[PDB]
Design a protein around this ligand. Sequence first.
Ligand SMILES: *Cc1c(COP(=O)(O)O)cnc(C)c1O
Ligand SMILES: *Cc1c(COP(=O)(O)O)cnc(C)c1O
Ligand SMILES: NCCOCC[C@H](N)C(=O)O
Ligand SMILES: NCCOCC[C@H](N)C(=O)O
Lengths: 419, 419
Amino acid sequence: ILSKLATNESPYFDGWKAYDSDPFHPLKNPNGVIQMGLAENQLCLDLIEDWIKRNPKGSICSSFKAIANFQDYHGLPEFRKAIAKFMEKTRGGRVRFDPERVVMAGGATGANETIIFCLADPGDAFLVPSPYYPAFNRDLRWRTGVQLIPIHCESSNNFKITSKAVKEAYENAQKSNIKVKGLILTNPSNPLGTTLDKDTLKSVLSFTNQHNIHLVCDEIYAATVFDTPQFVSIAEILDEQEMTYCNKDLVHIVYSLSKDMGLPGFRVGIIYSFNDDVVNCARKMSSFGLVSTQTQYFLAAMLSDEKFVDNFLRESAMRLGKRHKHFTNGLEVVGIKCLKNNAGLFCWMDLRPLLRESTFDSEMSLWRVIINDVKLNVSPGSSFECQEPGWFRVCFANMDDGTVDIALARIRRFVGVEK
Amino acid sequence: ILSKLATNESPYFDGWKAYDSDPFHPLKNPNGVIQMGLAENQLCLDLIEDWIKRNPKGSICSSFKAIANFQDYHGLPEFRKAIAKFMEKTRGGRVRFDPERVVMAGGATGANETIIFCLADPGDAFLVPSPYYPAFNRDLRWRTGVQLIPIHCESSNNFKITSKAVKEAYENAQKSNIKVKGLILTNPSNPLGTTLDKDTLKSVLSFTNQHNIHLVCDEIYAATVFDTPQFVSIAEILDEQEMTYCNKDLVHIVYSLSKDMGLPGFRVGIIYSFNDDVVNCARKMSSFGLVSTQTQYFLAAMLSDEKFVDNFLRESAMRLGKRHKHFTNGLEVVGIKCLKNNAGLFCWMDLRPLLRESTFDSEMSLWRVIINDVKLNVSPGSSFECQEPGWFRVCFANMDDGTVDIALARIRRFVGVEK
Ligand SMILES: *Cc1c(COP(=O)(O)O)cnc(C)c1O
Ligand SMILES: *Cc1c(COP(=O)(O)O)cnc(C)c1O
Ligand SMILES: NCCOCC[C@H](N)C(=O)O
Ligand SMILES: NCCOCC[C@H](N)C(=O)O
């Protein structure tokens, strides 16, 4: 006699399974499936590996007893500070983050779930532009009892958020007598890999503020921007003249080191709320997903080395851009267009012309050819609740140059032999 | 407009505050408050510190990329295995643990909360003997909407669980039309520091099984036993002849390394369920509180060193016992009796004769003298929902010999100057 949650728990996992089954390897499995579905950042690990060698004092008492026995939920004082500065830094030191507000959580997964707990009761709702990070359906609803309402986005205006589409989704929900507690954005965007425009942000923070609902911003890809415009954080939107009168009790940021540092395995999630009560409730809830002191120690060390941090953010961006363009260009050879983007660890590719029809059935049909016959594991627009068929997210930050070129040839091959 | 949880959130923290304010230190603050309220294990850290030095390969790629990028929620294969054996070992290898069942969680705090999510819906109930680990009131209810029903325990039969008291609490709840989904024990016991008797366990697993409700066992102090009888794990109760027919879907274990290894800061919580569905649901929920891969690596290394593990469990028990007896004896000099115990990092001291009356008001009165005038931070029975005044939990595993002797003198002093 389990609980509802237990007693109530795989079609979009076909790609992921096809790979695990026949995993590509240059020598061992050369005709294997190339992983292009997971958003990992590895074009920089050599930068982190390096740092670790020349600095044999950023771990295991380089004070072992202290970090091992330390169990306060504000975490190590120096850990907070290094996280707050790493954040100011990512937004070009154009804003200040008070580390006394920095709260921990089980990576961004626990961050997003915890914040929802703080802003909505079972049954309440949250608005969210589509396409969006699929795990949201779990992270934001499963144990929170909170439901998600989609704000529709299409290819015409390149998938931008419009006051029309927002009030559309918003008002619509009201008819059904649904209580909307807030709106959650992802900026830079996932799966679009696009940094939201400054005015666009303003419009949304306006709508949000004009209806006293929250604006949760998951800026986890903040340090993956590799091309203009420059990333405008919500923290910056608030320090602006015309936005001075917005209620900071409605604004919150959700961060993590899993994507712009390539450390998803360290489970470093952060919640930076402009609301003191939320900061409180959020911290008390962090004792369910506190970052390991052992890991807090190591990061306080590495993130305190300005020289390293400045080099990384710069060096890393240079590679991501290099990689991205190299991939985009290859695709435009065989005539494949992508959604122009300047961030993320992937690109929003358009295969609408390869669809036999403009139906999801076709999208799923084509996708099967890619995971089985072209042997590349990629994600289909439907996985992200994209409301228009034909789009695929393709990740390019988890492999080396040679592999990126094999995939390109494979795509070049498949396309040629199709017209 | 926050959520109910946020918009709804300190008298028992007087002791904790008195210490932070005037913290004892041999030279700096010699007349300071001695910390005897926190259940930390440090009589062994030298054993762990040591191991780390002679083994400079149990951390940060001694394979950094791999552990850093690793994000599967079954965790590192070798991490599970070393945790499963460390567990078999703690129960005298008298039982076997299949590491394929080992699920992670945010320390025991996230373990206990996650399991409740899996076994009870908002409004359901759980039975729990009193006194109990105070954080339960948060860990088990706060975000689960599940309520706790106390099974009364008194000093007569030395605070044992009786079928009478259990069916008492159980049936009583039914009248009030409350749905009871299970019963959660702590063995060894907190704050009693007593390992439950073999037959006693059987009786409870019987009542539980005879009413198809769950039996969650938080055996977090399993490796702190320092005196007979020997710790009987619930895993062992199940491998017994007369218990062969009990439903394993109702039995679950909750573990952590925070108390018997002194690593509360590494947030290593485990859930070992004999129920395959719970194991599933529990794992999917672990992605909210996964142990850091960086920490999984280090533990897979140290816990794989049998020689070390055998020495530790043995060495550690020897010190805990040494310390405990030395403390108990001192107390019996001035005539202070404690509840006989063979585990934990504290002792259940009886100050009933010092109470001016048999009321909690008196208990709180006396407690004030101890935290302010005798300057020792200790926990009062009421903090643990003890239903009878006069008992105090006093922790003795977080300081050295000299400090343990100062406290004893302080208590000797206070007692003398009181009769
Ligand atoms: C990858 C991702 C996450 C996961 O963050 P973790 O730290 O790994 O938990 C959350 N949100 C978005 C939008 C992501 O892309
Ligand atoms: C100390 C304690 C906990 C906390 O375990 P953590 O790993 O620190 O989260 C849970 N339950 C009991 C009974 C405890 O004594
Ligand atoms: N979508 C389920 C959660 O897994 C985390 C996301 C992962 N980084 C990915 O991009 O698939
Ligand atoms: N009681 C609140 C949770 O803190 C954890 C428990 C701690 N180890 C203690 O013994 O006080």
